[PDB]
Design a protein around this motif. Structure first.
Motif, mmCIF file in Angstrom:
data_model
loop_
_atom_site.group_PDB
_atom_site.id
_atom_site.type_symbol
_atom_site.label_atom_id
_atom_site.label_comp_id
_atom_site.label_asym_id
_atom_site.label_seq_id
_atom_site.Cartn_x
_atom_site.Cartn_y
_atom_site.Cartn_z
ATOM 1 N N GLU A 196 2.896 -35.676 79.785
ATOM 2 C CA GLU A 196 2.416 -35.550 81.173
ATOM 3 C C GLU A 196 2.320 -36.877 81.928
ATOM 4 O OE1 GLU A 196 -1.334 -33.567 81.731
ATOM 5 O OE2 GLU A 196 -0.499 -31.556 81.361
ATOM 6 N N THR A 220 -2.019 -37.846 87.444
ATOM 7 C CA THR A 220 -1.942 -36.463 87.906
ATOM 8 C C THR A 220 -3.173 -36.166 88.760
ATOM 9 O OG1 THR A 220 -0.891 -35.857 85.812
ATOM 10 C CG2 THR A 220 -1.724 -34.081 87.184
ATOM 11 N N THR A 224 2.481 -27.259 92.398
ATOM 12 C CA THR A 224 2.658 -28.650 91.981
ATOM 13 C C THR A 224 3.688 -29.420 92.798
ATOM 14 O OG1 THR A 224 2.111 -28.030 89.693
ATOM 15 C CG2 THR A 224 3.110 -30.180 90.043
ATOM 16 N N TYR A 265 5.972 -33.445 92.879
ATOM 17 C CA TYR A 265 6.320 -34.683 92.168
ATOM 18 C C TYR A 265 7.628 -35.280 92.653
ATOM 19 C CZ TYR A 265 9.560 -31.964 89.183
ATOM 20 O OH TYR A 265 10.571 -31.140 88.770
#
Length: 706
Positions: free
Chosen positions: A19, A23, A57, A59
């Protein structure tokens, strides 16, 4: 017939912490859809909508690990999944809209900088609910996006509302003209729960006004956002032998059409094989016009159980043929498995078309399946354990190690050969699971990138270089230059030896160079040593005649000169700009190394098979002798790179993306031409690199690792 391969990119592939370090989890009050949205700062950002439309999510593609990712939690699931959701970058901000179930109108506002910054927090007003309509009665299912201030909705009853933004965060309903067609289907015979439900499942927007749409019953409509009146309403199902019996009416919403320039393209239910492409032609006094033209079919054999996954109409690429104009990159699915095709249109005339396909499995995935890897270090179990961890990498390896405990299975001793076959199969599996298609994306100009369900996973479909086609198309074809045939008659033999046998030889060849097979000997005796020791009584004599005779009708001296000096060994790159990448791009980084690997692997196979003939036949060690000593050099080099590939991928990458000094951060490709270019460049640094131990510290290092 296969022109592109599949290069798999796991953004965390190189790293060991499954991960991203940083985060962040914002609240309010993936495994569903995922896609890439390009941004102002030439930075792609990927999004995922938690299976249950619960979580969303975010990213950065170019830097998954160090970069930051956001897990924007939500008050409650949207209406009709990823459909009742849209994402557009207003101005230095991302604007997310989500008609939650309750009928609220959630609107997120994320600063550009908050994505590429450090902040573990976001304050002020970025999220806010709303309720500009009672979606209690006429529930929606296809939230769309038109302008920063306007964008239409779509109800399950062929209806459509509207949302106008006056201030900075406010929307108010603006119905059009349908009401008429709605109120009267009441006065005609009936109107049940789903009788004449030509609900919308696709849409677009030509020249900021025309909402070229489509209905469940392929009825194509073309509203006017300067009228709020449905300008037309074609009946797609009647422009060619209207297959009576059963026309699969659009059930589950989906990406059923895309539009490029003037043109449009549409998938239509006919044993799955209908891409109606009737170009547009809108101005004239008459304000609208859909000019049907052709209806190309798909070669989706195997019963046709391949639902579209997404697709895209767009410019020419750069493939085999010359005849070019348009490319319909189409992507289908079937269970997890998927197929990607590029549909080449030779001429503007919609009748001269040619389909191109690509390999649906990474070369790596393919090696393991058909047990074809001859380089990977075998033996122990904690070894075969180490391997798997590498070939699969942290994320996938950890998911599979959980699933093996969840399912009550653990390791007996440190040689639980059964845990293996297990871990192994779960891995094939977790990976294919993770690699499920979901949406195309054109990284740069025309580079095909497939986004997969499980985040940090993407798949790039690369255009094969010449060798790569022969490799991937050996059994797949006939004809082609002499070299191809030669390479196949060679393959047509090697294939029949066992791997233990190949390894054993490649092994020996490695020695002729390291010296383990003493220099003194003539490069004519070794080759016989490497015959009693590796090939005597190791193959059926019968196939040996085939090879010999078949091998005859070949101008060997030549074909081999083309192979070694125009196919494998590159000449000189007078540096055709790759665009020295300033900041470290992790994506482009692995797309290189994987692609580098894919090539050398194919070289390695070829290199290996060639040499194999120099031992199985008395040929003049003084004529071809020029080559051999070159072949061995290559063979020995390829192998070393390969072994290194496995040992430590992140490492191998840094020493290969800093070796190109000026570009000690990577390159920034934008087209398959720039890509191959680069690859081959490294293909070189490898083939032109010294392999001589200038000391012991080095002889050791070599004896070990190799």
């Amino acid at each position: 017939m296969a022109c592109l391969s599949r290069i798999d990119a796991n953004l965390l592939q190189y790293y060991e912490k499954p991960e991203p370090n940083n985060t962040v989890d914002l609240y309010v009050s993936g495994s569903e859809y995922s896609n890439c949205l390009l941004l102002s700062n030439s930075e792609y950002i990927c999004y995922h909508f938690s299976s249950r439309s619960t979580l969303l999510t975010f990213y950065p593609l170019s830097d998954a690990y160090h970069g930051k990712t956001i897990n924007i939690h939500l008050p409650n699931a949207s209406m009709n999944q990823r459909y009742t959701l849209t994402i557009q970058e207003v101005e230095q901000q991302l604007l997310v809209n989500v008609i939650l179930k309750d009928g609220s109108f959630l609107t997120l506002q994320l600063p550009l900088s908050f994505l590429f910054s450090s902040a573990n927090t976001l304050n002020g007003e970025w999220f806010h609910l709303q309720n500009p309509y009672d979606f209690t009665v006429r529930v929606p299912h296809f939230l769309f996006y038109v302008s920063p201030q306007f964008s239409v909705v779509f109800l399950e009853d062929g209806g459509l509302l509207g949302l106008k933004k006056v201030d900075g965060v406010h929307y108010e309903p603006l119905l059009f003209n349908d009401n008429s067609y709605l109120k009267s289907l009441t006065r005609f015979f009936s109107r049940s729960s789903k009788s004449d439900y030509d609900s919308v499942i696709s849409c677009k927007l030509f020249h900021e006004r025309y909402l070229i749409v489509l209905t469940q019953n392929c009825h194509l409509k073309i509203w006017d956002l300067t009228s709020f009146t449905l300008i037309q309403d074609y009946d797609m199902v009647s422009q060619s032998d209207s297959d009576p019996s059963h026309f699969r009416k659009v059930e589950a919403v989906g990406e059923y059409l895309s539009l490029y320039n003037n043109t449009l393209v549409t998938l239509l239910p006919l044993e799955n094989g209908l891409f109606q492409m009737g170009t547009l032609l809108v101005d004239s006094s008459g304000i609208l016009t859909y000019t049907f033209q052709n209806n190309i079919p798909t070669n989706l054999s195997a019963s046709a159980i391949w639902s579209i996954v997404d697709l895209v109409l767009t410019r020419p690429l750069e493939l085999n043929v010359e005849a070019s104009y348009l490319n319909l990159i189409v992507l289908w699915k079937s269970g997890t498995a998927s197929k990607l095709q590029i549909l080449n249109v030779n001429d503007e005339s919609f009748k001269n078309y040619e389909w191109i396909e690509s390999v649906n499995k990474s070369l790596v995935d393919l090696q393991s399946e058909h047990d074809l890897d001859i380089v990977t270090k075998t033996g122990d179990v904690e070894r075969g354990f180490c391997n798997l961890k590498s070939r699969y990498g942290t994320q996938i390896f950890e998911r599979a190690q959980q699933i093996l405990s969840e399912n009550k299975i653990i390791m007996a001793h440190n040689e639980d050969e059964e845990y293996l076959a297990n871990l192994e199969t779960i891995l094939r599996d977790v990976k294919t699971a993770f690699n499920e298609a979901s949406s195309i994306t054109l990284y740069g100009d025309e580079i095909i990138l497939v986004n997969c369900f499980q985040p940090y996973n993407h798949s790039l479909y690369k255009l094969n270089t010449t060798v790569e086609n022969w490799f991937y198309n050996m059994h797949s074809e006939t004809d082609g230059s002499e070299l191809f045939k030669y390479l196949r008659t060679l393959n047509g033999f090697a294939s029949t030896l066992s791997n233990d046998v190949l390894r054993s030889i490649s092994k020996k060849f490695l020695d002729i160079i390291t010296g383990e097979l003493p220099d003194s000997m003539t490069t004519v005796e070794k080759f016989t040593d490497i015959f009693k020791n590796c090939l005597e009584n190791q193959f059926e004599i019968t196939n040996l005649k085939i090879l010999f005779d078949e091998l005859n009708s070949f101008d060997i001296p030549v074909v081999l000169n083309d192979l070694i000096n125009n196919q494998m060994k590159p000449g000189i790159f007078w540096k055709k700009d790759f665009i020295s990448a300033i900041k470290f791009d992790g994506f482009t980084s692995i797309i290189s190394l994987e692609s580098l690997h894919q090539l050398l692997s194919i070289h390695y196979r070829i290199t290996l098979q060639v040499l194999l003939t120099f031992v199985l036949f008395d040929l003049d060690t003084e004529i071809f002798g020029q080559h051999i000593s070159t072949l061995l050099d290559l063979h020995y080099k390829q192998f070393l790179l390969l072994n290194l590939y496995r040992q430590d991928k992140c490492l191998l990458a840094e020493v290969l993306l800093k070796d190109s000094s000026e570009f000690s951060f990577g390159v920034k490709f934008f087209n398959y031409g720039q890509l191959i270019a680069y690859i081959d460049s490294l293909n070189s640094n490898v083939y032109n690199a010294s392999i001589t131990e200038n000391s012991f510290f080095m002889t050791f290092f070599r004896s070990y690792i190799i």
